Amino acid sequence: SNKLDSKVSGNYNYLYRLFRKSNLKPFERDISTEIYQAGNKPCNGVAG
Amino acid sequence: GYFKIYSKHTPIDLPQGFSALEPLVDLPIGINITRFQTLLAL
Ligand SMILES: *[C@@H]1O[C@H](CO)[C@@H](O)[C@H](O)[C@H]1NC(C)=O
């Protein structure tokens, strides 16, 4: 669907997930926007 | 991913006896469930 899901300036509407605490179980949907806790220090709900 | 409810009614600690349960409702919702609570009519 390159003729309907792409734009010259870039289509940023579609987003995916790159980091999560654990693997998803089959037939599960996650829409949580919580910041990933990569380190021990809490993210405090902000990037860093 | 389905919610199955079986129910039974009877006239009367739980009593001694056998009474099987019939199926009423299957809700094809499919939501991750971890807790639950009940509601009374005060
Ligand atoms: C369901 O929620 C509980 C709450 O902590 C979580 O531990 C569990 O991993 C969740 N399961 C799925 C399949 O989302």
UniProtKB/Swiss-Prot annotation, chain A:
The segments labelled Disordered in the record are 18-48
Q: What is the effect of changing residue 15 to Q?
A: In strain: Omicron/BA.2.12.1
Q: State what protein this is by name.
A: Spike protein S1
Q: What is the effect of changing residue 8 to P?
A: In strain: Omicron/XBB.1.5, Omicron/EG.5.1
What is the protein's quaternary organization? Binds to host ACE2. RBD also interacts with the N-linked glycan on 'Asn-90' of ACE2. Cleavage of S generates a polybasic C-terminal sequence on S1 that binds to host Neuropilin-1 (NRP1) and Neuropilin-2 (NRP2) receptors. Interacts with host integrin alpha-5/beta-1 (ITGA5:ITGB1) and with ACE2 in complex with integrin alpha-5/beta-1 (ITGA5:ITGB1). May interact via cytoplasmic c-terminus with M protein. May interact (via N-terminus) with host bilirubin and biliverdin, thereby preventing antibody binding to the SARS-CoV-2 spike NTD via an allosteric mechanism.
| Purpose of the protein | Attaches the virion to the cell membrane by interacting with host receptor, initiating the infection. The major receptor is host ACE2. When S2/S2' has been cleaved, binding to the receptor triggers direct fusion at the cell membrane. When S2/S2' has not been cleaved, binding to the receptor results in internalization of the virus by endocytosis using host TFRC and GRM2 and leading to fusion of the virion membrane with the host endosomal membrane. Alternatively, may use NRP1/NRP2 and integrin as entry receptors.
Location of region: Receptor-binding motif: 1-48
Q: Which domain of life is it from?
A: Viruses
Mutation effect (residue 46 to A): Increased resistance to neutralizing antibodies
Explain what the record says happens when changing residue 16 to F: In strain: B.1.1.298
Q: What is the effect of changing residue 7 to T?
A: In strain: Omicron/BQ.1.1
Altering residue 16 to F: what's the impact?
A: Decreased HLA binding to NF9 epitope. Increased binding affinity to human ACE2
Region annotation Immunodominant HLA epitope recognized by the CD8+: residue ranges? Answer: 11-19
From Swiss-Prot, chain B:
The domain of life is Viruses
Chain positions carrying an annotated carbohydrate? 32
Outcome reported for the amino acid change (mutating residue 32 to Q): Increased resistance to neutralizing antibodies
Its assembly, as annotated, is: Binds to host ACE2. RBD also interacts with the N-linked glycan on 'Asn-90' of ACE2. Cleavage of S generates a polybasic C-terminal sequence on S1 that binds to host Neuropilin-1 (NRP1) and Neuropilin-2 (NRP2) receptors. Interacts with host integrin alpha-5/beta-1 (ITGA5:ITGB1) and with ACE2 in complex with integrin alpha-5/beta-1 (ITGA5:ITGB1). May interact via cytoplasmic c-terminus with M protein. May interact (via N-terminus) with host bilirubin and biliverdin, thereby preventing antibody binding to the SARS-CoV-2 spike NTD via an allosteric mechanism.
Q: What does this protein do?
A: Attaches the virion to the cell membrane by interacting with host receptor, initiating the infection. The major receptor is host ACE2. When S2/S2' has been cleaved, binding to the receptor triggers direct fusion at the cell membrane. When S2/S2' has not been cleaved, binding to the receptor results in internalization of the virus by endocytosis using host TFRC and GRM2 and leading to fusion of the virion membrane with the host endosomal membrane. Alternatively, may use NRP1/NRP2 and integrin as entry receptors.
Name of the protein described by the UniProt record: Spike protein S1
Placed within the complete protein, the shown segment runs 199 to 244 of 1273
